Design a protein around this motif. Structure first.
Motif, mmCIF file in Angstrom:
data_model
loop_
_atom_site.group_PDB
_atom_site.id
_atom_site.type_symbol
_atom_site.label_atom_id
_atom_site.label_comp_id
_atom_site.label_asym_id
_atom_site.label_seq_id
_atom_site.Cartn_x
_atom_site.Cartn_y
_atom_site.Cartn_z
ATOM 1 N N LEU A 179 40.042 58.745 49.545
ATOM 2 C CA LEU A 179 40.367 59.261 48.216
ATOM 3 C C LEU A 179 41.195 58.208 47.462
ATOM 4 N N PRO A 180 40.825 57.836 46.210
ATOM 5 C CA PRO A 180 41.588 56.792 45.496
ATOM 6 C C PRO A 180 42.906 57.257 44.871
ATOM 7 N N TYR A 222 36.579 51.264 51.110
ATOM 8 C CA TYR A 222 36.273 50.859 52.482
ATOM 9 C C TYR A 222 37.196 51.518 53.489
ATOM 10 N N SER A 224 31.930 41.676 46.812
ATOM 11 C CA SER A 224 33.306 42.106 47.060
ATOM 12 C C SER A 224 34.209 40.872 47.067
ATOM 13 N N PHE A 225 35.525 41.060 47.227
ATOM 14 C CA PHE A 225 36.458 39.940 47.247
ATOM 15 C C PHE A 225 37.427 39.990 48.425
ATOM 16 N N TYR A 245 38.372 60.833 57.228
ATOM 17 C CA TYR A 245 37.219 59.928 57.262
ATOM 18 C C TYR A 245 36.985 59.373 58.665
ATOM 19 N N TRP A 247 43.697 61.310 53.901
ATOM 20 C CA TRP A 247 42.261 61.170 53.681
ATOM 21 C C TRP A 247 41.606 60.164 54.608
ATOM 22 N N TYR A 253 40.755 50.176 48.591
ATOM 23 C CA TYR A 253 39.967 50.293 47.363
ATOM 24 C C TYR A 253 40.032 48.963 46.626
ATOM 25 N N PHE A 254 38.872 48.479 46.158
ATOM 26 C CA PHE A 254 38.721 47.207 45.462
ATOM 27 C C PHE A 254 38.201 47.462 44.056
ATOM 28 N N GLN A 303 31.827 50.172 53.843
ATOM 29 C CA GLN A 303 31.814 50.667 52.466
ATOM 30 C C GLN A 303 31.387 52.144 52.481
ATOM 31 N N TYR A 330 44.243 47.858 46.801
ATOM 32 C CA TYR A 330 45.318 48.700 47.327
ATOM 33 C C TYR A 330 44.814 49.494 48.524
ATOM 34 N N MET A 386 42.312 51.917 55.144
ATOM 35 C CA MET A 386 41.523 52.373 53.998
ATOM 36 C C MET A 386 41.919 51.499 52.814
#
Ligand code: NA
Lengths: 9, 198, 242, 273, 99
Positions: free
Chosen positions: A1-2, D27, E55-56, D171, D167, D7-8, D32, D99, D5
């Protein structure tokens, strides 16, 4: 979850 | 995805009051407080993101995320503090959920009560006559008239800032000739020492 | 701060309404909220600059929000219904969501079947009692705003051309003149307390002003009585030595 | 640590090719699971892993909402950063963000982190205390002041320690059959058909997940950087990765050398000759 | 400001003539993100191939893998050709079976 806070730079 | 706070709270001038707010959510982001005066704009008081205490002058707000609650504590209460206090929950994104609100009533500390019912006159008395019940203590209750032709307003506190004086007052009026100051507030329980001039 | 216009609005069922919001300059986020009597603000729509990111809170498709230049915003209500009657609040945040919100004063909208019973107030000032003066050395002036419909008024006291708040107290809620009527007219009272010496000076001018929000020039009126337009109704008095 | 975990985000301006493009990718370790691309006519978050498909339509609408908001946020951010650096509307610029939360072998939070870049260079990063920012320049100091007033650090710390950890565990549990399974490498030493005095020694590793591996060539002493050909860990197409190590021998006395592996999928490190 | 792409042309499995595996071309360490990658069989045009999502890394430079299945691992030569804003002409790297 972002991260759910979107803040303008 | 909800929150609860008391409907109303009554406190005396100079005292303290705590408004508690419990919430239920799966993704909490913040708890905030807003003050809204009748027919006015809600104004920001404090914001709690992390657990802890936010202190801003006389007001403070606490948060306990594990217990899903927060509170607003108002100290050294003033007459201007009488308003609606809303707690607000942020749950991610932008959509804020506000509570139903807590209406706070601040009772004026009347040092020298002098209850009295006075009569006022108009420039052109071809309409009606006004009766003013004033200078009674904040514990005194004012009720509506039995007569359908007699209108009685609710009480409200004026502040003569220069003289550091505060007073309660209620207005009564009728166009009928039967209407008089002596009978004007009969349905209310007025003090025994109420002054009546003639 | 955030500004809103009009402060009050009375509309006829079926007519279109436009609510304006001018937020704080540079604020990216704009919110619209609906506030019902004795409740908290409920989310209507969200903007970031000119982009409307969400409108899930709008009660009907008759409601349309815009912020074309990312500054001033409008909330338009087509074919207004009685259920649309509420306080509409707009808010702004500097750089995004989950931030401190800065609110406007709101628009208090009332939608009626028609405007036949819309009335401006009648304003009268009642001079202080000589009995009050002799007993307390204080003088209370009383203002009565009567026969107004709807409850869209703003009462103010003006002493020697300047608006006063000290020694002033107006009823939080008006009373219904005919409680049996569903479209009952209203009465509102206010008091202004001054020292006996201040009321005794004949050079002192006291004015009770009531701003009433009613009809505009755009509104049609074919009735015998004067058009109940948005107007200021006043009652004045001068100092009495006696 | 055992699992992570991340996020990009990429926000890219493109004069003459439409409005700035926002891409968000999630990810769990090297896998992914979510993708958002603003370039579609009607953009939505897409499932990218089998274990995420089970998530209800509420999860997907919540993901789509923050990514739609971020598209708009980052458009304004690119415009503001152009202004801070006195750059015109002419050029193409990129904001990158990464992050996430790192969980230890115990499954508890080891490290929460957040970093932002502008045109491939460090811009603003959250500190190890998760309470303050490190702004790389004067432009990033203006972003810091905005982010301090918005209470970004407080809400980011709470997310990294709470929802991020919560979360990621969900997962890992749902994808336990593929995520908590670590495959070991297939090791062997080789030599290419060369010319005279052009002989070399090559150590290989070919099938592993995760990508983390250590290949070293030492026997008598410790040469380290002294003539040891290091190659970047290259992917296969599934979860599989590859890597090799080399050492020059332009004559014939190479039985005195030993290659060593360190992949976590193996029971203990192997010795190769 | 700008970074050149690093290139590696290799296979998934170490096979020999007559049987299947995949010809890999991993392009990494580049900035900006726009890139053009194609696989070559005897100097030209492997029919439209596949690529992993861009991606990076920690250093902010971009990376992706370009792959195609190569059944004819014969005496014929294979290579990867890459075009980026940083290059004056596309960089061609020949496939070496032993690395
Ligand atoms: Na530039």
């Amino acid at each position: 979850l972002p991260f759910e806070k979107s803040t303008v730079m | 995805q909800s929150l609860e706070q008391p409907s109303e709270v009554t406190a005396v001038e100079g005292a303290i009051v705590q408004i508690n707010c419990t919430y239920q959510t799966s993704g909490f982001y913040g708890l905030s407080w807003y003050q809204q005066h009748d027919g006015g704009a809600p104004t920001f008081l404090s914001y709690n993101a992390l657990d802890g205490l936010e202190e801003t002058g006389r007001f403070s707000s606490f948060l306990s995320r594990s217990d899903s609650y927060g509170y607003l504590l108002l100290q050294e209460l003033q007459m201007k503090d009488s308003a609606s206090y809303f707690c607000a929950v942020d749950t991610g994104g932008f959509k804020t959920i506000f509570g139903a609100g807590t209406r706070l009533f601040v009772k004026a500390n009347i040092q020298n009560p002098d209850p009295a019912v006075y009569q006022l006159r108009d420039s052109k008395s071809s309409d009606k006559s006004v009766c003013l019940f004033t200078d009674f203590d904040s514990q005194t209750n004012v009720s509506q008239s039995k007569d359908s032709d007699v209108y009685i307003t609710d009480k409200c506190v004026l502040d003569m800032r220069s003289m550091d004086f505060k007073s309660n007052s209620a207005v009564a009026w009728s166009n009928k000739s039967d209407f008089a100051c002596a009978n004007a507030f009969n349905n209310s329980i007025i003090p025994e020492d109420t002054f009546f001039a003639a | 701060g955030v500004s809103q216009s009009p402060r009050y609005k009375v509309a006829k069922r079926g007519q279109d309404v436009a609510l304006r919001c001018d937020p704080i300059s540079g604020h990216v986020s704009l919110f619209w909220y609906q506030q019902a009597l004795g409740q908290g603000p409920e989310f209507l729509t969200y903007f970031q600059n000119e982009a409307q990111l969400d409108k899930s809170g709008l009660p009907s498709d008759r409601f349309f929000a815009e912020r074309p230049e990312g500054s001033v915003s409008t909330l338009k209500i087509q074919r207004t219904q009685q259920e649309d009657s509420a306080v509409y609040l707009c808010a702004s945040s500097p750089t995004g969501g989950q931030e401190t919100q800065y609110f406007g004063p709101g628009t208090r909208l009332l939608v009626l079947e028609d405007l036949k019973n819309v009335f401006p107030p009648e304003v009268a000032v009642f001079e202080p009692s000589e009995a009050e003066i002799s007993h307390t050395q204080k003088a209370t002036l009383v203002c009565l705003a009567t026969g107004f419909y709807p409850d869209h008024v703003e009462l103010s006291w003006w002493v020697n051309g300047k608006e006063v708040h000290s020694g002033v107290c107006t009823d939080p809620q008006p009373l219904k003149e005919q409680p049996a009527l569903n479209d009952s007219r209203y009465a509102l009272s206010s008091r202004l307390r001054v020292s006996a010496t201040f009321w005794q000076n004949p050079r002192n001018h006291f004015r009770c002003q009531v701003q009433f929000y009613g009809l505009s020039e755009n509104d049609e009126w074919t009735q015998d009585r004067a058009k109940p337009v948005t107007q200021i109704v006043s009652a004045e008095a001068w100092g009495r030595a006696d | 640590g055992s699992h992570s975990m991340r996020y990009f985000y990429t926000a890219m301006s493109r004069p003459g090719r439409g409005e700035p493009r926002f891409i968000a990718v999630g990810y769990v370790d090297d896998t992914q699971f979510v993708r958002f691309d603003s370039d579609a006519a009607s953009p939505r978050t897409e499932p990218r892993a089998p274990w995420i498909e089970q998530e209800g339509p509420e999860y997907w609408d919540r993901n789509t909402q923050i990514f739609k908001t971020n598209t708009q946020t980052y458009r304004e951010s690119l415009r503001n950063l152009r202004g801070y650096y006195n750059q015109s509307e002419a050029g193409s610029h990129i904001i990158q963000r990464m992050y996430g939360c790192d969980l230890g072998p115990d499954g508890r939070l080891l490290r929460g982190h957040d970093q932002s870049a502008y045109d491939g260079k460090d811009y603003i990063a959250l500190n190890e205390d998760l309470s303050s920012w490190t702004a790389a320049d004067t432009a990033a100091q203006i972003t810091q002041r905005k982010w301090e007033a918005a209470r970004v650090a407080e809400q980011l710390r709470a997310y990294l320690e709470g929802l991020c950890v919560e979360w990621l565990r969900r997962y890992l549990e749902n994808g336990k059959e593929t995520l908590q399974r670590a495959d070991p490498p297939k090791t062997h030493v080789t030599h290419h058909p060369v010319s005279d005095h052009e002989a070399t020694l090559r150590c290989w590793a070919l099938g592993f997940y995760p990508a983390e591996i250590t290949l070293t060539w030492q026997r008598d002493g410790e040469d380290q950087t002294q003539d040891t050909e290091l190659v970047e860990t290259r992917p296969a197409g599934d979860r599989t990765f590859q890597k090799w190590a080399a050492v020059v021998v332009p004559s014939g006395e190479e039985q005195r050398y030993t290659c060593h592996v360190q992949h976590e999928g193996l029971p203990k490190p192997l010795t190769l000759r | 400001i700008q970074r050149t792409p690093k290139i590696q042309v290799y296979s998934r499995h170490p096979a020999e003539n007559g049987k299947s595996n995949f010809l890999n071309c991993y392009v990494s360490g580049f900035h900006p993100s726009d890139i053009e990658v194609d696989l070559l069989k005897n100097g030209e045009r492997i029919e439209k191939v596949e690529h992993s999502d861009l991606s990076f890394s920690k250093d902010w430079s971009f990376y992706l893998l370009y792959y195609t299945e190569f059944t004819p691992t014969e005496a014929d030569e294979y290579a990867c050709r890459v075009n980026h804003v940083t290059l004056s002409q596309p960089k061609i790297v020949k496939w070496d079976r032993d690395m």
